[PDB]
Write a protein that binds this ligand. Structure first.
Ligand SMILES: [Zn+2]
Ligand SMILES: [Zn+2]
Ligand SMILES: [Zn+2]
Ligand SMILES: [Zn+2]
Ligand SMILES: [Zn+2]
Ligand SMILES: [Zn+2]
Ligand SMILES: [Zn+2]
Ligand SMILES: [Zn+2]
Lengths: 393, 393, 393, 393
């Protein structure tokens, strides 16, 4: 397994550049030069790089400074051929954002936040990005009376719809991807799961260019099944981008390497990205992006190790996932279990409610006890999947 | 605090009639006669009663049997004056439903399930119910390859839209309320939280008469904030019914008395039901329904005790919640914290994206460090809330 | 694969005999005859079978039925060669144990529960069981004031010390093993984790013959590291038995097949049982017992499928865990990371606290900043275990 | 309210001095001078202050700065009367402790960590602290093969037994108290709960002077009952100190004010510290320490607000918990439910295991079905605690 740019593996600057500072300690690694991030990742097999405005350009940078930094970064990009498919904004690190950007209680903060996003849409568009991700990490509260909850959503809506109107007006080839997280840094974050993100989008004036950016560890922090959540996002055609990593349980955001958390769940996500749905349906085509953090115990040899571990893990899972579905035994098991019968509509062509209620065979004389005897054999289909995952098959 | 029918407290037959059978043991109480459930609840202060088709009418009941049971129940209702505001279907107890009703892999089961719902819509409508609740408790899986996930949602949609077309066609004054649960009895249940329910509704052909039935312990089983979740349901105008109870943590569905779980969260839910949003917004008006189970350690004196504890808890919380918002000190704290500033739109009337980006004051010359100095004083507003909850104020 | 009697795969009667009644439904399978259970198990390659008193002998059986049932049971054991390595008592299904057995608030139920155990101790000895397990499933509460928490631990101590004392008194060659569970069926169960169980054994009079029976799923219900918890049980020399199964997350006790829950943790669990510790130390040499339940969606073909899969999964994992430790690149990765170095004592032979008093070479003249650059390379080390697990290396 | 020095409210320097840097952001508050910290605390009514070595004396400070800093510190203590009841060491912020202190894989870092502790023991004695706390925050791993799990417990034992042995050697009037935490900053921390900590102390050489320092939030991060866990610590006679705070759910360590997390559990926690056990037994008589952190959204007015609220909340709860136990209806509800009956021994004075051997009056002729009808009335009993807590009774 060796990644090629054809694989479409993307990494954030903040991922391999994460310096190690956590809540109980200081950084354990020196800052990463962006030029070096670009060059290193291009030699590993990366397709592209992604960043937050302040990963690159300091908050306080003068114009001369900004210009140099950008000339350095664009240079690096030209030299290596790396694409910039997604750009995001930092609305969580400066003290000004302690109560949120878009949903701050303070109105002047709300406007600075939105100003900071619009300017960043411009940059994103100069960089050639197709996706604009929003992670509202400071939107929310520790306490239940701190917010007017209906007003928190109107403020959110105002922000996101102003950003979208501006894309439409400028003619930029950008789509917005919202990224859910249930908690941390706030005790409760607004629009905590894929479900809440998808709902909110339907109340937006310009929701057609607004979709999701689910992260594997984020949905697992609320104990949900990542594979089910992206399946609903795909089903509604709102899966615009995806962040892969690992999480080992309901706790702080670990941001481990993809496959370093729940393995079987990783296998099944790769099967859904690569094979689509058993009966047909939309398929995901964008970047396979890694929003992870190299453990702080490791030095720089560890950082490029981890980066490479992400693309390896994925490729290994993919090989198993493709062998899994190509196995005849696995296809037989699938049929037995009624994985293909689920895809047939319940009603017959032009049969209505009334006609169904009246079909005697379907209700009044249905032999419920007899139908209850089917052996779905779900245990056996899961066993076959694990056996292909362990490559013992 | 004494409940009156004006309070709109509703109870399910299955709640006070829960016999005690759990996964590790048999029933500890004798079955409850429905006539007696009706009469008892009317003397406690209940407004109405609710049930599942098989709580009342056995699965296997002959027509003579069904007719008697219904004559007994309707009698009881006439005598006491109890209303039947919601009716639901049991698609989880018979063995036939082991893989789901609507999303079973087996197609004949899917049709029986839907047949069983349509017939039940008829009954619901004869009983005078305004709400038809669906709890898809067996829809989902233990294993990730057991389902074609896109096909699971199409099947769900087919069922729910056939039920809704039939209401519209019959002219019945019914609305469908979906009820989320993340897990149990299945390892993962489809449409696990309020978020996922609200999303799904937007893909329905007839989603205008389809809304939610959130349960306090269900959202807490995924660790979310119940108060935030119903605030998004209210904001989208999709809060059709609500199930109140208590849950003490992420574990099995406890179904404790309302207030017997997370107290502060209960206080804040009552504040949202009773006071609405601080800046104005939709308000909830339906039944205040209790879907709880009297602990199995208690005998029948315990059952009516628990029933009464539900309405008491709520009334006590309500008195505190109304005193809380009426306190001048609390209103001052609210202003200070910017609870009312959140309600002012970010942009000025007819100010666009472009005009905002260009306002110098809003971005280029915004003094971020200075704005970061505001003391939101959220700790102090939470302290005042707790002090009103403990009635020490 | 191919399990053989020397593998020491023991299975309980309640596992394959689990008919499928959960909280929201009735059994989906017909009762399993015990003689049938013995023959099928033996033919799959099991070494032994375990049971709860009431699993074999009805709570109501007369003396005449006890001996008839035992007759056929002993004959089957005889005809097949299964051993009976562990026995346990049912102190949770009958409504009389609704507040517990040993810690029941009612004294006459405490006596009845203790009496039931004493007699089950005589049957255990009779069968040749080396271990007598205690799962206190109903010891706990839903409410914090339901119990005197000190007296609940005094009544638990009394029961376990009376039973232990009776084993010593009759000279049975039996050990007691407590089985922790954090909740379900009680809201909170006493001695909820391995730690708590371990701590508790140290306050008994007859502690010497009391140890633990940790279960994968149950520590995973508190979000804990199952391998870390068994390590501590083993390190303490209290790992008397083990229950293997699968759990996906903090939720109800799933009791899935071993390997169908957290797969990487199962990998490392098998590594500790089979290889023990990297530097040398204690080893677990008792039986590998499966405490699981066949999914209720599947017929009897799933039941025997599910029992074979337990066994397969443990041997596939065993295989990959033997190749992993044997691999010279892993052994070297291990050396780089300091695994063997953790094995050296901190203090030099003869060094005192004053001597070291941090020595400086160890304190004053120590270069903290230089020691901090060490790359532990834990990420690379984790990547080698996963490729070994995926069958890749 | 009105806290006074006899209340024994102790606060750490890092709590009110917590500037607000979390994982996604920088500090939102200016550094708090220690002399200032002492004066403000004393004027609020605190009895004492606790600190980590590096909280007061920089990791780099020279000998000359240590003594200057200690000079002013002792003077402030002097001028105000605060005592210094507990001292602890920082073994987690400096990058050198990235794999731990005592269980670091690197031997030279194990020595450096132990040396740091030994010297901090001499400062503790000097200050008059009675307790020396140990929070092993970096002892653990992200990955299961990063450690030899047996050697990690041997290296932890070595460190605590060397430190204890040195206390005994110098004749300091000091006790060691371990502080459990299940995770964060490590993915898995060793001795993650009260049980584990308790079990671990029993394998030490110098166990007699080692006990625990449980923290509300930290057992709540594993979903456990904090009152149940302190009960067991107390019952074991190992409850040497206590850390009080608030946590809403399984997520990152929130460190909220005591009472702003699980309010009913806080109620019952205060009932156990203040009233002890219903039937009589051990009592906790040390200090009431607050290990919390003022929300980062709030300025310095919130910091002193948040410190007063800890104290208020504990006295409001204390008040309601004294009225609850004193209430004659509660005392009678208690009798009905069997709380006093749990206090009686199971066996009669002189009864042997053979004698009882279940006696029958206790086994054979026992009417299990009749004993099962007992109404324990735990629901009514819970309803009386909540109305006592809501200020209603
Ligand atoms: Zn992400
Ligand atoms: Zn993340
Ligand atoms: Zn409900
Ligand atoms: Zn429920
Ligand atoms: Zn279990
Ligand atoms: Zn078990
Ligand atoms: Zn903490
Ligand atoms: Zn603490």
């Amino acid at each position: 397994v060796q990644p090629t740019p054809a694989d479409h593996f993307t990494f954030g600057l903040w991922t391999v550049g994460w310096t190690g500072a956590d809540p109980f300690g200081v950084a354990t690694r020196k800052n990463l030069d962006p030029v070096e991030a670009v060059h290193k990742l291009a030699e590993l097999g990366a397709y592209g790089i992604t960043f937050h405005d302040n990963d690159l350009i300091p908050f306080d940078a003068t114009e001369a400074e900004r210009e140099k930094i950008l000339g350095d970064f664009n240079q690096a990009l030209k030299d290596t051929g790396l694409k910039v498919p997604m750009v995001t904004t930092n609305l969580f690190s400066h003290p000004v954002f302690k109560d949120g950007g878009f949903t701050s209680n303070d109105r002047s903060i709300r406007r600075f936040a939105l100003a900071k996003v619009l300017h960043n849409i411009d940059l994103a568009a100069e960089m050639g990005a197709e996706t604009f991700v929003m992670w509202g990490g400071r939107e929310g509260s520790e306490y239940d009376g701190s917010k007017d909850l209906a007003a928190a959503l109107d403020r959110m809506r105002e922000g996101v719809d102003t950003a979208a109107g501006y894309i439409k007006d400028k003619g930029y080839n950008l789509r917005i991807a919202l990224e859910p997280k249930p908690n941390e840094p706030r005790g409760d974050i607004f629009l905590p799961t894929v479900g809440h993100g998808l709902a909110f989008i339907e109340q937006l004036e310009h929701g057609d260019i607004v979709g999701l950016n689910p992260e594997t560890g984020h949905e697992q922090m609320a104990g949900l099944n990542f594979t089910h959540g992206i399946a609903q996002a795909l089903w509604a055609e709102k899966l615009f981008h995806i962040d892969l990593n690992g999480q080992r349980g309901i706790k702080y955001d670990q941001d481990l390497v993809f496959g370093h958390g729940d393995l079987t769940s990783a296998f099944f996500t790769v099967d859904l990205l690569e094979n689509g749905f058993p009966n047909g349906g939309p398929k995901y085509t964008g970047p396979r992006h890694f929003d992870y953090k190299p453990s702080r115990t490791d030095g720089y040899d560890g950082v490029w190790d981890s980066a490479k571990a992400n693309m390896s893990m994925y490729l290994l899972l993919k090989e198993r996932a493709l062998a899994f579905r190509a196995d005849p035994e696995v296809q037989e098991a699938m049929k037995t279990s009624g994985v293909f019968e689920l895809g047939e509509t319940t009603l017959n062509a032009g049969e209505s409610a009334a006609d169904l209620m009246n079909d005697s065979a379907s209700f009044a004389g249905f032999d419920a006890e007899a139908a209850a005897e089917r052996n779905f054999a779900f245990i056996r289909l899961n066993q076959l999947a694990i056996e292909h995952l362990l490559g013992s098959r």
